[PDB]
Structure 1
Amino acid sequence: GLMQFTLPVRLCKEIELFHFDIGPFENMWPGIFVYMVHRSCGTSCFELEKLCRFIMSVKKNYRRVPYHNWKHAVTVAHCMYAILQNNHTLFTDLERKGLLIACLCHDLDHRGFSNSYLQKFDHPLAALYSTSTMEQHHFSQTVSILQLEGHNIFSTLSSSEYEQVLEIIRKAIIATDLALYFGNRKQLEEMYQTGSLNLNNQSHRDRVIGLMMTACDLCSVTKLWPVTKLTANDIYAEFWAEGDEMKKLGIQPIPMMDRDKKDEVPQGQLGFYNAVAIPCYTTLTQILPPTEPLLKACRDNLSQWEKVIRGEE
């Protein structure tokens, strides 16, 4: 009832900014998340005891991989918190509840390998889920944890509201499959430029939440340069391990995944900013103008990768 989470002053101010970094203190991350839920959603949204038990079971089901870990989950949830806080009136009660949970859960039980690697390995999950393999797995783990004893944070919702929130979470988690992003963003780009984008149209809201999910998921490219650059090392630590596992299956990995091609990382980042990141934050900014700081920070980081190529660092 009367129990608020409060943070130290620097975190209390910086957490509202898009480029906030959650810090190296793992034990403070549950508190930062509950803080965000309380301000994004209400202190009434969830029973504290149930939400705490849920967060700790979610944490326990993230693995100790270099990038797709608990720290990525909380980071992606913080970006969603900053989008929601800058767009107060655009989103429903169920959406505010569902989307922070979706973000915390979106990579549950990730092993550090792409959908492609599971399909080439012939992983059991690639028979159970023929597309968006890992994302259907993450949603499955989310429903699992929701059904543990004392972990139902949506218990106060009706049957039909519960079903709507699990459908928000399902679509939001599926949308983090970057293979689906290209087409989603093209459709949003055409819809916004013919002026047919309508936020009372459920299929349209769905697409706009999908693009938010991509934006939050990629938000390492919207941080201050030293955070962006050190995160990129964790991302490539995973990619290069996948490359090694590809070579164990007798397959030349794509260069993105080949550690022998470490030299090509700056040019690889240019391709990624130009083909994915910049277009993502561009279309997001057209639909939700107060998200422009993510586009600005992404452009600042592309310019830093351009300097790495020109040997100015």
Structure 2
Amino acid sequence: TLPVRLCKEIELFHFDIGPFENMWPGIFVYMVHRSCGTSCFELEKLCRFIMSVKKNYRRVPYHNWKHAVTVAHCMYAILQNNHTLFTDLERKGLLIACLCHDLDHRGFSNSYLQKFDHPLAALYSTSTMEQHHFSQTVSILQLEGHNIFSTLSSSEYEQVLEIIRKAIIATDLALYFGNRKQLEEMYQTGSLNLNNQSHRDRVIGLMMTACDLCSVTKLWPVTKLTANDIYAEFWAEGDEMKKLGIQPIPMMDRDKKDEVPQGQLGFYNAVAIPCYTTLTQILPPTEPLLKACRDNLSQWEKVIR
């Protein structure tokens, strides 16, 4: 039961979740029931679970509670347009993974933490933050009245945990390049097969990347506005890097503000476009992300003068 405008435009890939946090949870529950079903989860146990997650997000310009819901909607959009491809376990499992994918994020990349010699970097040699994101998740599920998979069998429960584990880790962009490249080949040869679990995890992996980056697939005015939040995080990290006696890459250097239009251009070309390209090849219904992406690419070129 969502407002008419929302019920209608929530099915759109480029949908924005507005500036109404209090309404954010509701928007999520709605999507679970439309994609998975009403009796997938007990309402109260779910709502309790949601509030807890909202609470374990930090007020960081970009990787915050809004990012979490936004990413999830893209997944919902992907799920609804490929409705016959996945089980409920995967559906109910993937939506949850998206909301938790950046839990307890502080706004610093894995690079900085290793430089800073942070306790977590010692704890997780690779994919430091993402491993923490999943750690946070399990802690929340282990809370009383928080196990929404209570009704699941221990077999099913373990399965959905793996799904969520694999998914969350995939939000490490460093892992993306190897994943896309592999998928690019397998698609070409025809060896690519969704019934292969090893193959299947990789698609899911690429699906997660598409969502984590979906701000490039929004309309131009949203994409441009979201951009401010992201560099806010980058430049701040650059500052802390500088506090370590370390010259940061120009991307995190606030002195190089002008360069940003080209910095984005390069990123689209090298990362974003190849990503949604590959995805539409495998999942044609996901093209609107790609089209919207290129529309934004054209805008960036239009910025340079």
TM-score (norm 1): 0.97
Deviations 1:108-164 (A, max 9, x none): 000000000000000100000000000000000000000000000000111111000
Inter-partner Cα distance in structure 2 for 1:94 and 1:270: 38
| Cα deviation 1:163-195 (Å, max 9, x = unaligned) | 000000000000000000000000000000000
| Residues 1-313 of structure 1 mapped to structure 2, 5 A cutoff | 6-310=1-305
Query: How many Å separate the matches in 2 of 1:56 and 1:193?
Result: 44
Give the C-alpha shift of residue 267 in structure 1: 0.5
For structure 2, the 5+ residue unaligned runs are: none
* 1:262-305 alpha-carbon deviations (Å, 9 max, x no partner): 00101000111011110110000000000000000000000001
Measure, in 2, the Cα distance between the counterparts of 1:7 and 1:268: 39
**TM-score, normalised via structure 2 length:** 1.00
Describe the SS at the equivalent of 2:179.
Answer: helix
Is there any run of 5+ residues in structure 1 with no aligned partner, and where?
1-5
Deviations 1:3-50 (A, max 9, x none): xxx111111110001000000111100000000011011000000000
Task: Measure, in 2, the Cα distance between the counterparts of 1:173 and 1:195.
Answer: 27
Deviation of 1:104 after TM superposition, in Å, equals 0.3
Measure how far apart 1:230 and its partner are.
0.6
After TM superposition, the runs of 4+ consecutive aligned structure 1 residues lying more than 6 A away are none
For 2:191, what is the secondary structure of its paired residue? coil
How far has the Cα of 1:92 moved from its partner? 1.3
Q: How many residues align?
A: 305
CA distance in structure 2 between the aligned counterparts of 1:37 and 1:85, rounded to whole angstroms: 11
Q: Deviations over 1:52-89 (max 9, x none)?
A: 00010000000001000000000000000000000010
User: What is the DSSP-based 3-state SS (H/G/I as helix, E as strand, rest coil) of the residue aligned with 1:89?
Assistant: coil
Distance in 2 separating the partners of 1:295 and 1:146: 35
User: Secondary structure in 2 aligned to 1:263?
Assistant: coil
CA distance in 2 between counterparts of 1:35 and 1:272 reads 34
Equivalent residue of 2:195, what SS? coil
Secondary structure at the counterpart of residue 90 of structure 2: helix
- Partners of 2:128 and 2:304 lie apart in 1 by 35
- Output the CA distance in 2 between the equivalents of 1:49 and 1:7: 19
* Deviation of 1:93 (Å): 1.5
SS at match of 2:40: coil
